Structures are given as C-alpha cells and as structure tokens.
Amino acid sequence: GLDKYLPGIEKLRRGDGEVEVKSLAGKLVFFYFSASWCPPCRGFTPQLIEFYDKFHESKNFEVVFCTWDEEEDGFAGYFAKMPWLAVPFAQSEAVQKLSKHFNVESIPTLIGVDADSGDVVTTRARATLVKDPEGEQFPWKDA
Numbered sequence: 001g002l003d004k005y006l007p008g009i010e011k012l013r014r015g016d017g018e019v020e021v022k023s024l025a026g027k028l029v030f031f032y033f034s035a036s037w038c039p040p041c042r043g044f045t046p047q048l049i050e051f052y053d054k055f056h057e058s059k060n061f062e063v064v065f066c067t068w069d070e071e072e073d074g075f076a077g078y079f080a081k082m083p084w085l086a087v088p089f090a091q092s093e094a095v096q097k098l099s100k101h102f103n104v105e106s107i108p109t110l111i112g113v114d115a116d117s118g119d120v121v122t123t124r125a126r127a128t129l130v131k132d133p134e135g136e137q138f139p140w141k142d143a
Contacts, residue, residue, distance in 0.1 A: 001118040002029065005101070006087065006094055012064060013079065013086040024115045028061040028139055030125060033099060033109040035068035036078040044108045045082070047130060052084060055135050061112070066095045068107055112139050 002021055011018040032048065034041040052063055063084035069075055075089045087095050098104075102111050102123065110125040121139050122128070128140035 001114065001116045004118045005031070005098055005113065006091075009087065009091055009094055011088070013088055014084075019085065024062055026060065027115050028059075028112050028121060029115045030061060030063045030110050030112045031066045031098065031102075032063050032084075033066045033068060033095075033104050033107045033111075035107060036074050037069065038107045041108045044126060044130070047133070048110065049083060051129055051133065051135065055138070056084075059135060059138055061139070062115075066098060067092065068095075068099070 002024065006021065009021060011020055034045065048063065056062065063082075065079055065082055065084060065086035067075060067078070067086070067089065069078060070092075072089045079086045102109075104111075108126050110129065111123050112121040112125055113119060114121055120142065122142055124142065125140050128137065129135075132138070132140070
C-alpha cells in the first residue's frame with residue numbers, strides 16, 4: 001500500500017526512535033507537508049495536534065510528517081514538537097518525490113491515503129480540518 005508513496009522505506013521516526021511502516025496496517029495515513037520556516041504552518045500545526053490527540057485512535061489514523069526544511073539540525077527540534085511520525089531527514093528525496101506526486105505547491109498540506117490499498121482518500125484535509133475540528137465529516141473524502 002504505502003510502497004507507492006515511500007518506495008523502499010521500512011522505518012519512520014517516532015519520538016527518539018523508529019517504527020516499521022508495517023505497523024500502519026489498516027490505518028488511514030495522513031502525509032503532513034510542513035516546515036519550520038513556513039508562516040501558515042505555525043498556526044495550523046497545533047490544530048492538527050489537537051485533532052490527532054482527540055481522534056488518532058478512535059478514527060484509526062496516523063500522521064507522517066514530510067518535511068520541507070532543508071536544514072537537518074533544525075529537523076530534530078521541529079519534529080520534537082509533534083506527537084506523530086516522520087520520514088527521516090535523510091529520506092528527503094522520497095519526500096520531494098511524494099510532494100511532486102501529489103502536486104503539493106504550497107504548505108501546509110495534508111493528504112490522506114489508505115495504508116493497505118494505497119488509495120487516495122483526501123487531498124484537502126488541511127482546509128477541511130480547520131472547518132471541522134470534531135471530525136464530523138472525516139475523512140473528508142475527495143469527490
């Protein structure tokens with residue numbers, strides 16, 4: 001499923017260690033494209049954290065941070081403030097190619113895919129989440 005999006009990546013960052021991508025079986029996976037330098041990301045990130053804390057278990061999803069930062073040494077610091085997963089900084093090429101695959105032209109952007117099938121569920125969750133904090137229309141399926 002996720003192989004399409006992260007070709008040959010087996011592990012993702014979580015806190016100070018890693019998890020296997022296999023642990024995402026059955027979940028909806030949101031790729032969160034953001035960066036420490038991005039002005040609109042500052043206000044969006046805490047809204048996403050609130051939604052994640054409330055619903056990641058009950059609505060069975062995960063968030064994978066896909067960085068647009070180009071300084072590693074800030075990466076630790078920026079990801080440290082998030083509760084979810086991340087593509088490792090050294091796998092930035094995979095992030096860039098994923099950004100292109102999804103035609104991400106600006107950040108923040110939040111795209112949800114089904115882990116098992118790889119199917120795209122929503123490409124507009126950054127816009128829809130701010131208008132639906134209780135997730136009454138989650139997962140905001142694309143037409």
